[PDB]
Structure 1
Amino acid sequence: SHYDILQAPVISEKAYSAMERGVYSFWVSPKATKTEIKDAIQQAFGVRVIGISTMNVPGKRKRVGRFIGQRNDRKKAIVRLAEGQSIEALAGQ
């Protein structure tokens, strides 16, 4: 479909202060070739994309417990729609 794949929105501030310029970024799935993803998004928020950019990310933490940690691996993705700025409102957040 479309609504699938995306995993969640990238909160952070840069992302947010990146939104004020119509650049929305969220966490897609690790395996999710730059195209599928380009697609999905379009059809979930109704809008095209002039540019895309994505890269993978590891995790490995803990607080304590001789249970070290373990990565958790994500894939932040950053898009850019056509001058027709904004997406829903889940932007002005």
Structure 2
Amino acid sequence: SHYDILQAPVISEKAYSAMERGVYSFWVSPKATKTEIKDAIQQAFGVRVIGISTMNVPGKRKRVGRFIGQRNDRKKAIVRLAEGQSIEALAGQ
């Protein structure tokens, strides 16, 4: 449904500097598509998406204990909105 799909917001410094331009970035379901992802943001936040660019991302740590390691596997979606920008207030984090 709506509320699932978007797992978490992209933290970092580049997303926070993108925030300032009305560009919001999210960690989404890897299986989720552009249409499906655009819908969920448009709905849950009540804002029109004028553009969506998205791409898949791998994993692979370990620290100690010869426990092989393992990937983690995400997907990052970045959206642009028309002049009527902003998300909640959950932008000035």
TM-score, length of structure 1 as denominator length: 0.96
Q: Flag structure 1 segments of 5+ consecutive residues without an equivalent.
A: none
Structural mapping, 1:13-92, within 5 Å: 13-92=13-92
How far apart, CA to CA, are the structure 2 residues paired with 1:18 and 1:62? 31
How many residue pairs align between the two structures? Answer: 93
How far apart, CA to CA, are the structure 1 residues paired with 2:61 and 2:30? 19
Calculate the aligned-residue CA RMSD, in Å. 0.8
TM-score, length of structure 2 as denominator length: 0.96
Q: Flag structure 2 segments of 5+ consecutive residues without an equivalent.
A: none
Q: CA offsets per residue over residues 45-77 of structure 1, 9 Å max, x none?
A: 001100001000000001111012111000011
Identity %: 100
Detail structure 1 runs of 4+ shifted over 4 Å in the superposition.
Answer: none
User: In the TM superposition, what is the alpha-carbon distance from 1:85 to its structure 2 partner?
Assistant: 1.5
How far apart, CA to CA, are the structure 1 residues paired with 2:44 and 2:82? 15
User: In the TM superposition, what is the alpha-carbon distance from 1:2 to its structure 2 partner?
Assistant: 1.2
